[PDB]
Design an enzyme around this catalytic site. Structure first.
Site, PDB file in Angstrom:
ATOM      1  N   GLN A 263      24.753  71.873  56.067  1.00 40.16           N
ATOM      2  CA  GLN A 263      23.513  72.071  57.010  1.00 40.16           C
ATOM      3  C   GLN A 263      23.541  72.988  58.015  1.00 40.16           C
ATOM      4  O   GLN A 263      22.685  73.383  58.346  1.00 40.16           O
ATOM      5  CB  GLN A 263      23.336  70.664  57.521  1.00 40.16           C
TER       6      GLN A 263
ATOM      7  N   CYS B  51      20.410  66.873  58.441  1.00 42.04           N
ATOM      8  CA  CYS B  51      21.163  65.988  57.597  1.00 42.04           C
ATOM      9  C   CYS B  51      20.094  65.100  56.713  1.00 42.04           C
ATOM     10  O   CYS B  51      20.546  64.731  55.616  1.00 42.04           O
ATOM     11  CB  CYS B  51      21.926  65.045  58.572  1.00 42.04           C
TER      12      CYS B  51
ATOM     13  N   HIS C  56      22.919  59.608  61.811  1.00 40.64           N
ATOM     14  CA  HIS C  56      23.008  60.578  60.695  1.00 40.64           C
ATOM     15  C   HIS C  56      22.850  59.977  59.310  1.00 40.64           C
ATOM     16  O   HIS C  56      22.855  58.801  59.143  1.00 40.64           O
ATOM     17  CB  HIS C  56      24.545  60.984  60.768  1.00 40.64           C
TER      18      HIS C  56
ATOM     19  N   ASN D 167      28.839  63.637  52.439  1.00 36.75           N
ATOM     20  CA  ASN D 167      28.400  64.292  53.930  1.00 36.75           C
ATOM     21  C   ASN D 167      27.821  65.536  53.696  1.00 36.75           C
ATOM     22  O   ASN D 167      27.831  66.239  52.597  1.00 36.75           O
ATOM     23  CB  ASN D 167      29.543  64.209  55.039  1.00 36.75           C
TER      24      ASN D 167
END
Ligand SMILES: *C(=N)C1(NC(=O)[C@@H]2C[C@@H](S(=O)(=O)c3ccccc3Cl)CN2C(=O)C2(c3ccc(Cl)cc3)CC2)CC1
Length: 215
Positions: free
Chosen positions: A19, A25, A163, A182
């Site tokens: 990102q 996110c 997140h 992630n």
């Protein structure tokens, strides 16, 4: 449900993305879940455009590089009638005017599903549905510095999350884990993945706001 699941081995998951310096996110978590559901439906994995979400889903309540919700992103895809491929609408890491083009839309949904707040419910969803968008408390330096192993943070909140990530499976040794993708690039953690503590009182709130799109 099975003792372990890994949706990467089934072709549901794109490689790890980054990102960069943009609070997007939520958009990566959303494209990850929609990539998985599109693959379930069509048998084709196509990388989806986060930039499309960043630039265009303000009406649904998202705030571009300042944060947003995967559910708002799923609603946008419904309201909008589509979402462009990553290839057609590349990632810039900054908010720009909307340039959605339906000619290059490769994904759609008819809403989303909020999983009830139990890790049992999340496990069943992961086993049966595909990768699941989740909210977690990542606001600890232990998360920033994570490298390998099963992540457990004594100070993690089960209630306040900051997140959005993507659960792509789960597995076992106590020390059961969620396998989490992630969006910080492949240099972070275990090639961009983290193993989060599973069945330890909803650790880091991972079952508190789990969802996926209806496809
Ligand atoms: C991503 N780089 C950043 N984090 C967020 O945008 C997160 C994503 C979601 S969440 O997963 O934390 C969450 C929290 C609670 C309930 C559901 C969900 Cl999905 C929201 N994020 C936030 O930081 C907040 C937020 C909420 C709503 C909007 Cl429109 C903007 C921001 C503050 C909760 C930006 C670091």
């Amino acid at each position: 449900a099975p003792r372990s699941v890994d949706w990467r081995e089934k072709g549901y998951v794109t490689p790890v993305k980054n990102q960069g310096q943009c609070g997007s996110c939520w958009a990566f978590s959303a494209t990850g879940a929609l990539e998985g559901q599109m693959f379930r439906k069509t048998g084709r994995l196509i990388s989806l455009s986060e930039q499309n979400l960043v630039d265009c889903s303000g009406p649904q309540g998202n705030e571009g590089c300042n944060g947003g919700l995967m559910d708002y992103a799923f609603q946008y895809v419904q309201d909008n009638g589509g979402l462009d491929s990553e290839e057609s609408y590349p990632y810039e890491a900054t908010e720009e005017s909307c340039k959605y083009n339906p000619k290059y839309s490769v994904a759609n949904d008819a809403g989303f599903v909020d999983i009830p707040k139990q890790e049992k419910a999340l496990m069943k969803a992961v086993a049966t549905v595909g990768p699941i968008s989740v909210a977690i408390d990542a606001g600890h330096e232990s998360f920033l510095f994570y490298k390998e192993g099963i992540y457990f943070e004594p100070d993690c909140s089960s209630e306040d999350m900051d997140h959005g990530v993507l659960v792509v499976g789960y597995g076992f040794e106590n020390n059961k884990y969620w396998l989490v993708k992630n969006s910080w690039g492949e240099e972070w953690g275990m090639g961009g993945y983290v193993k989060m503590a599973k069945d330890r009182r909803n650790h880091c709130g991972i079952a508190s706001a789990a969802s996926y799109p209806t496809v």
